[PDB]
Design a binder for this molecule. Structure first.
Ligand SMILES: [Ca+2]
Ligand SMILES: [Ca+2]
Length: 112
C-alpha cells in the first residue's frame, strides 16, 4: 500500500523573474553588472531577486503634487512639487510609509 505524488511544481530562477519594485539594473564600464535601489538610493552588486516556486495542482495616475518628467538627455524622473524634491523612483511604486512609533511624550501603559 501507498500512493504516488501528484505534485506539479514550477521553479523559476532569479533572473528569469523581474526585478523587485524600485530597482534598476546597470553595467560598469567593464560590463560588470550591478543594481540600483531607488527605494533607498543605494547600489550593490548583489541581485535582489529570489527564485520562485509555484505549485500548479489542487501604471495609473500620479499622486497629488507629483510629476513625471524627462531631462534634456532624455532620462525619465519624478518631481515632488509639494517638497521641491526629485526622485528616480515612480511615486506609484512606493509602498505605504513607515508609521513612526508613538511619541516618547505620549500617554501609555506599562507592561515591562
Ligand atoms: Ca531611465
Ligand atoms: Ca538611471
Amino acid at each position: 500500500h501507498h500512493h504516488s505524488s501528484g505534485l506539479e511544481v514550477l521553479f523559476q530562477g532569479p533572473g528569469s523573474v523581474p526585478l523587485p519594485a524600485g530597482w534598476e539594473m546597470a553595467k560598469t564600464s567593464s560590463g560588470q553588472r550591478y543594481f540600483l535601489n531607488h527605494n533607498d538610493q543605494t547600489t550593490t552588486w548583489q541581485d535582489p531577486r529570489k527564485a520562485m516556486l509555484s505549485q500548479l495542482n489542487v501604471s495609473g495616475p500620479l499622486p497629488d503634487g507629483w510629476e513625471q518628467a524627462m531631462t534634456q538627455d532624455g532620462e525619465v524622473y519624478y518631481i515632488n512639487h509639494k517638497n521641491k524634491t526629485t526622485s528616480w523612483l515612480d511615486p506609484r511604486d512606493r509602498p505605504p510609509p513607515y508609521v513612526a512609533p508613538p511619541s516618547y511624550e505620549g500617554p501609555h501603559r506599562t507592561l515591562g
